[PDB]
Ligand binder design. Structure first.
Ligand SMILES: O=c1c2c(ccc3nc(-c4cccnc4)sc32)ncn1C1CC1
Length: 349
């Protein structure tokens, strides 16, 4: 078999070649990214005298049709004319090339997972975590403007990128899974660690799922490790329950997949699904306190911030309150961008 007259591999990806020139314009430097969507490459745009990131979508109907949605939303966001539009990556243009839809993005710096990794997963400071938190909240507010109503659907450290290596300004990338509040088309969405209870439970979802993901992200940026690191859905839900307890009955009562994780007693309350021969793996519900994970009264996560400025007890207590409001089980009462921005965690110095 030869795929796409030899230009593609067996997984519908374009065989990237360092040094190649496309359409007398783009010089391909190297692969910088790879996912289910396809690939991302670093490239120099001769015409515009600048570096770009080119997202090369897979040559297959299903992936193309999704990227067309991605392009529509990217263009709709970039088009919008408030100054909040610059927490979102800029889609410069797109084009078809050897049967691949290619999206051209401005060149940003590296992502927040790479940033975590540069400090050997010690975490970044609470001061820097705050700056990310403020910008992300402001960006989620943009996405909430009624004319947009976009759900990113895959927030995680990897999809938040620094603008410049030496500064805190960030932008959100990868709207390849995104949708608007009307036209939702998938039930199994978000990366697992950052997946909301509503999605785990098979319930309808709105823009609040991104705020859940942000809660999880912000904690991980400061501790250096994922808050809820499930190997599968059942593990994931169980790890959430360790920190936040059994979700409220009014939600589980409307949850198509409640019985995947939970069981309903005669009296109308819910427990975790009962386990084989009692073998214990999880901490009892609500026992793994965020208060201890963050190290609120014990010098920060792992004790590593003891006797540093910008990491007081009062600072942590604020941060913890914000995060708990972000991880509200109920998407109707979970904190929303406008009100998150008014939180005491952000208040001026
Ligand atoms: O990886 C990126 C980069 C991007 C701009 C947009 C962008 N969308 C990406 C993406 C990732 C996964 C799915 N869809 C898009 S990666 C990326 N600028 C720079 N870089 C890093 C090398 C420094």
């Amino acid at each position: 078999k030869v795929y796409n007259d030899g230009y593609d591999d067996d997984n519908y990806d374009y065989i990237v070649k360092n040094g190649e020139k496309w359409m007398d314009r783009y010089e391909i430097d190297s692969l910088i990214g790879k996912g289910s969507f396809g690939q991302v490459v670093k490239a120099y745009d001769r015409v515009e005298q600048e570096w770009v990131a080119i997202k090369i979508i897979k040559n297959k109907k299903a992936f193309l049709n999704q990227a067309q949605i991605e392009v529509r939303l990217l263009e709709l966001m970039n088009k919008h004319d408030t100054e909040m539009k610059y927490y979102i990556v800029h889609l410069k243009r797109h084009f078809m090339f050897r049967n691949h839809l290619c999206l051209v993005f401005e060149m940003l710096s590296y992502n927040l997972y790479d940033l975590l990794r540069n400090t050997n997963f010690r975490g970044v400071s609470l001061n820097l975590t705050r700056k990310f938190a403020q910008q992300m909240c402001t960006a989620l507010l943009f996405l909430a403007t009624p004319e947009l109503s976009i759900i990113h659907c895959d927030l995680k450290p990897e999809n938040i990128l620094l603008c410049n290596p030496k500064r805190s300004a960030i932008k959100i990338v990868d709207f390849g899974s995104s949708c608007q509040l009307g036209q939702r088309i998938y039930q199994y969405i978000q990366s697992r660690f950052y997946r909301s209870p509503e999605v785990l439970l098979g319930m309808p979802y709105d823009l609040a799922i991104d705020m859940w993901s942000l809660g999880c992200i912000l904690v991980e940026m400061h501790t250096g490790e994922p808050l809820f690191s499930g190997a599968n859905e059942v593990d994931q839900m169980n790890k959430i329950v360790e920190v936040l307890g059994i979700p409220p009955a009014h939600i589980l009562d409307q949850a198509p997949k409640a019985r995947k994780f939970f069981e309903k007693l005669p009296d109308g309350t819910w427990n975790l699904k009962k386990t084989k021969d009692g073998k214990r793996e999880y901490k009892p519900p609500g026992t793994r306190k965020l208060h201890n994970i963050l190290g609120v009264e014990t010098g920060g996560p792992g004790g590593r911030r003891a006797g540093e400025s910008g990491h007081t007890v009062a600072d942590y207590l604020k941060f913890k309150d914000l995060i708990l409001r972000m991880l509200d089980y109920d998407p109707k009462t979970r904190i929303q961008p406008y009100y998150a921005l008014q939180h005491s965690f952000f208040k001026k110095t």
